[PDB]
Design an enzyme around this catalytic site. Structure first.
Site, mmCIF file in Angstrom:
data_model
loop_
_atom_site.group_PDB
_atom_site.id
_atom_site.type_symbol
_atom_site.label_atom_id
_atom_site.label_comp_id
_atom_site.label_asym_id
_atom_site.label_seq_id
_atom_site.Cartn_x
_atom_site.Cartn_y
_atom_site.Cartn_z
ATOM 1 N N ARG A 45 0.753 -1.347 0.081
ATOM 2 C CA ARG A 45 -0.031 0.288 0.230
ATOM 3 C C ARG A 45 0.665 1.234 -0.318
ATOM 4 N NH1 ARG A 45 -4.237 -1.010 0.508
ATOM 5 N NH2 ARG A 45 -5.131 1.344 1.625
ATOM 6 N N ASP A 163 -9.066 -1.437 6.623
ATOM 7 C CA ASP A 163 -8.871 -2.358 5.913
ATOM 8 C C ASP A 163 -7.557 -2.924 6.551
ATOM 9 O OD1 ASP A 163 -6.782 -2.085 3.082
ATOM 10 O OD2 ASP A 163 -5.348 -1.378 4.091
#
Ligand SMILES: COCc1cccc(-c2c(-c3ccc4nccnc4c3)n(C)n(C)c2=O)c1
EC number: 2.7.11.30
Length: 328
Positions: A45, A163
């Site tokens: 990410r 997440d």
């Protein structure tokens, strides 16, 4: 930081010195600037993660791209919201920044875990009926503590990961876990009803239906908590799908592996999930062990196409904390 001081000394002084506050910035600054990086140990990410030593003691450093500074601040900011510390949540050590302009370097330092991510763990391993629970029970414990809303003095506001997944969970030597990466995390104050944050964030694959098809009510907090649960369910799938009751076990696989391609899309998921209403294939023969089934029961009570119907971290924690008693 005077001579002889150890990370162990610093951590202790903190977790036993009044407020749940971290170390003084000045001290965090010093730690970061004196960490001796070993070598890179992962990307993803936002920012690459390195393994580093401080006065010898291992520690984890997450070095950010100057461009992904917002993620950097959100984590640092959120971990420095009173007693966020918790056994089942990655331990913050320090946050720092150096240089300027285009070359600004943002660092976050946390505890180190030889076993790495739950993801890298479930890949190179086969858990027991025992561990399968420690792993889930702890993940549950943590998510429960995050969504929890301890009100008062040094109480914590409600927190939604946004997440949650196998790559954002770490396992210790004693087989427990702890959530990690609050980059997307969202706070919610009860004494004023608010939520400091805002689109469709998080890893596609682990996205829940209300988000995939965009219809999720971002005005109500619980909505976020609901999405966390759904994900944690996908995580539980990954765990047990790797349990080994008598040599029997399936190869490690990511949720919706046989359905959507590698590295899905928001559209390719809205299909397989929302419409076709498909969920990870719960092995038939998975009805062997009592506990192994309790899981699937929960997995089902997390994947409900309706957020309001899904269980809660706390509940899941309880029934799991229970199974911990009877079983094993
Ligand atoms: C506040 O500190 C946050 C932080 C610092 C360093 C790394 C990480 C982090 C890790 C992490 C944490 C500890 C580790 N220990 C050993 C090996 N890898 C690790 C990765 N993962 C898996 N993710 C997604 C992260 O954001 C988080």
């Amino acid at each position: 930081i005077s001579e002889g001081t150890t990370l162990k000394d610093l951590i202790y002084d903190m977790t036993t010195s009044g407020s749940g506050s971290g170390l003084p910035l000045l001290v965090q600054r010093t730690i970061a600037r004196t960490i001796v990086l070993q070598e890179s140990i992962g990307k993803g990410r936002f920012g690459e993660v390195w393994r580093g030593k401080w006065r010898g003691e291992e520690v984890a450093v997450k070095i950010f791209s100057s461009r992904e500074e917002r993620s950097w601040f959100r984590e640092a900011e959120i971990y420095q919201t009173v007693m966020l510390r918790h056994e089942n949540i990655l331990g913050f050590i320090a946050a720092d920044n150096k240089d300027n302009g285009t070359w600004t370097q943002l660092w976050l330092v946390s505890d180190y875990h030889e076993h790495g991510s739950l993801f890298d763990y479930l890949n190179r391993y086969t858990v027991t009926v025992e561990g399968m629970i420690k792993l889930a029970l702890s993940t549950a414990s943590g998510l429960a503590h995050l969504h929890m809303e301890i009100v008062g003095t040094q109480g914590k506001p409600a927190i939604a990961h946004r997440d949650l997944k196998s790559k954002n969970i770490l396992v210790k030597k004693n087989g427990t876990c702890c959530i990690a990466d609050l980059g997307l995390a969202v706070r919610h104050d009860s004494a004023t009803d608010t939520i400091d944050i805002n689109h469709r964030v998080g890893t596609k694959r682990y996205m829940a239906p209300e988000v995939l098809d965009d219809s999720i009510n971002m005005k109500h907090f619980e909505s976020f908590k609901r999405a966390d649960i759904y994900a944690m369910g996908l995580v539980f799938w990954e765990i047990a799908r790797r349990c080994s009751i008598g040599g029997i076990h399936e190869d490690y696989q990511l949720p919706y592996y046989d359905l959507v391609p590698s590295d899905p899309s928001v559209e390719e998921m809205r299909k397989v999930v929302c419409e076709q209403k498909l969920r990870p294939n719960i092995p038939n023969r998975w009805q062997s062990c009592e506990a192994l089934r309790v899981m699937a029961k929960i997995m089902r009570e997390c994947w409900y196409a309706n957020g309001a119907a899904r269980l809660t971290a706390l509940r899941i924690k309880k029934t799991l904390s229970q199974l911990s008693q009877q079983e094993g």
